[PDB]
Design a protein around this ligand. Structure first.
Ligand SMILES: [Cl-]
Ligand SMILES: [Cl-]
Ligand SMILES: [Cl-]
Ligand SMILES: [Cl-]
Ligand SMILES: [Cl-]
Ligand SMILES: [Cl-]
Ligand SMILES: [Cl-]
Ligand SMILES: [Cl-]
Ligand SMILES: [Cl-]
Ligand SMILES: [Cl-]
Ligand SMILES: [Cl-]
Ligand SMILES: [Cl-]
Ligand SMILES: [Cl-]
Ligand SMILES: [Cl-]
Ligand SMILES: [Cl-]
Ligand SMILES: [Cl-]
Ligand SMILES: [Cl-]
Ligand SMILES: [Cl-]
Lengths: 316, 326, 326, 326, 316, 316
């Protein structure tokens, strides 16, 4: 009669929690989990919710706390990017390599990562990417992927992807706000606009200048990014990433599933109607947090962005 | 985009509350209201409480507070419906026998022209028997006595009409409410159930003295193992003793169970303001409930923390004032 | 640098409180006190409450608590003024007619030599009429009856003197307090106003039976539209019926309005301890108030959160015990 | 590893509470219990409260609540011990003279076979005098009257036996509890002392009327300086008047002092469940206490914040029901 | 009947708030505001209180939040130093330039800053100041100004000043503490003494050594600051700045104006009497925060320093 | 009838507090204190509890706060390591020097530190340790000490030690948990396991490789540490330090003294029995916080580690 939130460690399954936070995000390298109810730290584990895999990772830390009136056991960790986030990238010449092959090679030391897949149309050969001493595997992978307009992330089953958004798939839920209409699902809504990365002119350095026509204020910027085609490619992606930073729509809904049974997952598009704020648009889900609390029960925070902006090269 | 809720006084709408509580109940005599805004002396003024242009209560502002400190100003208003007059003021020494129940009610409400109609909410309009009322009785007490003698009860309606009457269980439920931790179509925010065995007796011996204690009827539930006997004196034949004893047993039975549901908003899906006298179909698969309940009390609420809600005080179906509409 | 507040018991000063409440009121019989420090059995001991060497109350410690846990120890004391004896203990069956009011008060306080003077706080010292008191009456009840018969009221003064008397509205206001969100010279920290129409009646018929209900005086306010009649029996001529009915109307009128002001400190600017019986000029430009009010109750307070304050319970001027000093 | 606490109903153990309060007291008629878990209708069912397989109370579930919102479900149960029947139900008009106290108790508890034994907790089993009870008296009131006439008192024991009896001060204290901010062997978590002089009178004149107010005994404490006289009518010789007056003086004396100690757990070091009727040696060097106290009331408690504790309501030793075991 | 707190964005004026914090400070580069009650982010705006300009800036960020019981709109930003704080200083040789001219030149790209003024007696020519790659315009301006014993800040009308304190202007309010006397204005008082930058001997490096005579403890320091006159000038200013860090008097008063109608502003001197702590002195207001809260209404936090210590060269 | 918590500043003794935190730790450089009840900042001070010296330091900061209902005076500071933490290490060639002599020389500028002692069996000569510009005296001392398997800390009387743990001294208290048994002292217990510094293979760089046999997951690490004997010495110490980071047992007890009158102090071994969690072992106290609060009165937090792991060279 509730959500089956079924965690698996060492072939033991756990299904009953006082609270949790399970957070996935395209831009934050390693997705993470935290659960509150034997030393499980360092163990592999999986997170499923009503028959669908949600995260594959490793328990990083465990805490057992007690006082006279209470006793609690907590577990937290990250997905399998945790390895690539922590560990040093090798000296790798990826020039001429396929972005998928370079990603495969970077991930190779961790068999725990069992597939590496491309979520884009094509699989382009890479230029010379320098990897600096000290750089992590994730940093290296991000630079590589970003060089051809793509980005890395772990999927729920532990597959590493290098890819971008498919804006072709039709929105998979509609969410509305209403202080009247009880069909409406949205419990909380937070809208943020930020100007700190809007620039009036940006000079990228092989030189291309971008100028923002409606910007009346002076806010010049200069950026150090082989070919000029490789410049505007990478520069336009920087512009797109800054545009995305400038707006966030955070919606909290009850439960963990859409009104048709799909677990919220980054990558979905979501139609939002707020007749009161005058919103009727499609947004792109970039981050998603499954939450259970004593006070609010089960909810999902949905961190929604402007549609069509992120990784527009992946699938034009 | 939400509800327009006002306290209308002298044609003038007072709107924009930060919090309110509007409470109606068949058993509590005077329905009441309470409003606060936090960003003129109306005490003693006649008012109407209005939600989206529909009057939900007619009454009198009994009290007003203004409070100020550095950082806050709060104005509050409270009051009661027009039953407040009858609850406060004294019954005359009317003899009701056999004046119709509708005419003995009309009589008792006469001094308050502010109560502009008296209506019978019942199939039949019985000639009353002998009702002996004591002199410090309030109009309300007297009205309850009279009403209850014929298996009825008094209340005020939203527009200020006094009703003597009872429940109509022929009316189809107005809504189906359901509880679910996974079904988003289910809209119950909070469900509280209370069971109380205070007034659950093993045998109850009812006594009365005839026109001319010679009258005696005893009730037993063979499902009570515990010894808990009670004897009650009823104030003229085995028929009248049995009728009234049975009303007491039904009153006790109602006291034993309450289902309190909290919902967001103030209206059903088909636009009906929650109001006592409605029947509500409730489903809770977790608990195994699927039944119709009778709405005996309801509270319209606004808070900063929880926004707009209704508390629905629900009772077992078919039990209260069953004679009103057989 | 702040106030020295002590509970003096057996010449010994107990000082250094973390919190207290010292409450005086003309209408509540026994003024009270409550002290806590949080860093000897004095229960039943005689005490004086002293602020900056001035006694503000004379009474008896009724109760004491000591509480300890790891991290805190709290000692508390409560008590009442000397009216506590009269409130608790029984009146004799004195006949007062026409003993002077001052002599019937002296009589009733006689058993408590702890009350070391009885004073009349009134222009005239009327010979009392016939006052019929019932045997379980407390000295206080009896004293209130007697006092009220002649448009007076009893209280204890700070030094333990019993007063029968009333307000003096000839005394110039002792202070002007004002409210402002921009004027720093304005010193009111909190202003609460309450209006209540509970005891605001449309017509009131007063009845009494002569020496030898033949006495009847009815009051009406033509500004009441709502029907809210009341009849009151007063316990020997149209003059005495009218005098006492009017005192009841004034009591009701006082109940209908309270202005509660909170100020920092315990003294006016000219060094006067707030005390019931003072008149206070209040200005609130925001609200449109500029009037004099009569101080009926006051509470000296200390808390960790708010420090040193006084709550001032203010009433409409000129209404309470108007005969005491015409 | 902690206590197994259950509500046993129909052989079935309900365990796993998040919070409870189990309160027993010689002076409060019906001991009570309250349980909540927060992760079937048992109202009106017979139950036993059990700690580590030992029954601590026998009673009836009076009420049950289930509450649900998103994020919490809470089931609660309350009830009383078997004295609840006697407190609720009516005494017969038994004449007790001189039936033994044990036989007049047996009689009055007879209708509740649920009370399966009546025991006398006293040296002697006096033939009762003339006890005049009024008709709406409860079995409990009547039992208290009768019991108290012979310097005894009624209570229920954990297994459901009705006792008429008193304290045994020959029984050695069961435990020594001590308070210390530096001694870890000292186990008191919280110590609260209250002294109250409400019912401390200077002279008390006791009056009674003989078999055939001619009976009069007056008490004085020459340590009272304050005038606080009381007169009490007792309902047939200077011996019986003096016996009962003295019981009243002892009751008042007990009301004047309470020591409330809070301890972790529910058992003494030697495995005894805290229960009224035990004597407890208390040491607090800080306060200068080193004495034995009589346990009059006790509350087993569980909370999330404080875990498992017992509140021990302790009274001056040797004062309550001193005749029961001279 | 309250404070007219009148904010102006795009020629719309807003006057009614649930709360705000408006903070100005000589040492924190960009003053800031935050207000709680249409996308206003990136818009210019002004803050006035009862007819007197209080801050000129740009809305940096906006948030609209709502739940079932509540709805709130917040705006925050900084004064016009925000531009110079964010943006890269150019390669500028200021040698031989007047400090006012160098400040004018550094501010020139932002016409939004309409005047640049000197608040000192004279306007000295500067030495070679090196500006490092990456340094901001504010950092550069601070180094320049500091080189001649001065400091930069924005005034309420958006004028940039390079200057120092005028200790000649007489204290403009007296504030007292009293648990008795209700004429006394101070609601809260916080006094902080800190020793972390008191040194027993400081060697500045062209070498001058400072020695503290009452310092008994060993706490030596060495600092890397053209002329020797330029050394003791700049060294004595470092000593003065450390002395200032060692003591702060924070007073919270009700309202926003002195007992004669002047809005609290950094730069004023304030007589403080606390007969209870035994204080009777003049302090210099270095920072000022206008506050409105539900719980405490309108107040001002006044961050007061030792008189006469800061920028003693500006006006000897 | 309580703890005599007797602080001494300028020959004034203070004994009465609303709260305090007094924290000592082998790994955090400067132990610290904070007390809540005249400018005492910069003054030397001592902390004793019932006749036993507990900390020797310097008041770093003082605060006096008041509002209408309350007034409080706070003092905080650090032990005498505060000097060596703040100040620059000199250019010192410690090669051939005895570790005790090198420590003495590093501490010499602060006579406030009146003894420097070795808490190990022997006193080995040091190799070339380089001290970088900017390095503090404490950093230098730590590197020196660590180079020979030891560590620095200040003892309660202000003596500087370079040393390690004596695991020979028998446990000095037994602490138990019981929801029944009231003889049991433990009010709260927090157990933390963390895997972030467990590695599958560690290559130290003159090259030694460590391999963890039970580690199934790939987590390689490489570390830059004269002799090869000097490598495994220093490498094994790094391994031991990481092992210690992976587990902490935090126990809160009431009071400040063992059940035999010894003030809790880092360095003691403690037998812990938790029949409920199935713990029966000896742990090593690495950190200790004396606390007084209004809500919980006097307590000690005991930060306990795995026995025998830290500084195993000091006393084999
Ligand atoms: Cl990610
Ligand atoms: Cl599943
Ligand atoms: Cl990373
Ligand atoms: Cl009603
Ligand atoms: Cl009524
Ligand atoms: Cl509905
Ligand atoms: Cl009084
Ligand atoms: Cl009274
Ligand atoms: Cl004043
Ligand atoms: Cl009992
Ligand atoms: Cl009873
Ligand atoms: Cl014990
Ligand atoms: Cl600034
Ligand atoms: Cl203006
Ligand atoms: Cl900057
Ligand atoms: Cl340390
Ligand atoms: Cl000592
Ligand atoms: Cl360091």
């Amino acid at each position: 009669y509730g959500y089956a939130v079924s965690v698996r460690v060492g072939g033991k399954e756990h299904r009953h929690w006082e609270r949790y936070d399970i957070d996935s995000d395209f831009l934050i390298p390693a997705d993470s989990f935290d659960f509150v109810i034997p030393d499980l730290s360092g163990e592999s584990c999986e997170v499923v919710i009503d028959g669908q895999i949600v995260m594959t990772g490793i328990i990083g830390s465990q805490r057992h706390g007690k006082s006279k009136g209470s006793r609690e056991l907590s577990l937290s960790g990250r997905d399998l990017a945790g390895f690539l986030v922590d560990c040093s990238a090798p000296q790798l010449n990826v020039k001429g390599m396929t972005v998928l092959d370079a990603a495969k090679k970077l991930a190779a030391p961790w068999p725990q990562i069992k597939a590496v897949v491309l979520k884009a149309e094509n699989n382009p050969a890479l230029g010379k990417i320098d990897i600096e001493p000290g750089e992590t595997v994730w940093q290296a992978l991000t630079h590589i992927a970003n060089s051809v307009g793509l980005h890395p992330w772990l999927e729920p089953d532990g597959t590493l992807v290098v890819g971008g958004a498919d804006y072709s798939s039709p929105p998979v839920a509609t969410l509305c706000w209403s202080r009247t209409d009880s069909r409406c699902n949205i419990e909380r809504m937070d809208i943020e606009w930020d100007t700190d990365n809007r620039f009036s002119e940006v000079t990228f350095l092989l030189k291309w200048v971008y100028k923002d026509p409606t910007m009346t204020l002076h806010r010049p910027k200069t950026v150090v990014v082989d070919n000029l085609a490789a410049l505007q490619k990478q520069a336009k992606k920087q512009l797109a990433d800054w545009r995305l930073e400038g707006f966030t729509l955070t919606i909290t809904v009850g439960g963990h599933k859409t009104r048709d049974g799909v677990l919220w997952q980054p990558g979905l598009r979501v139609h939002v109607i707020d007749d009161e704020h005058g919103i009727d648009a499609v947004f792109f889900l970039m981050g998603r947090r499954f939450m259970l609390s004593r006070m609010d029960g089960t909810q999902t925070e949905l961190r929604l962005k402007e549609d069509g902006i992120w990784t527009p090269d992946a699938y034009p």
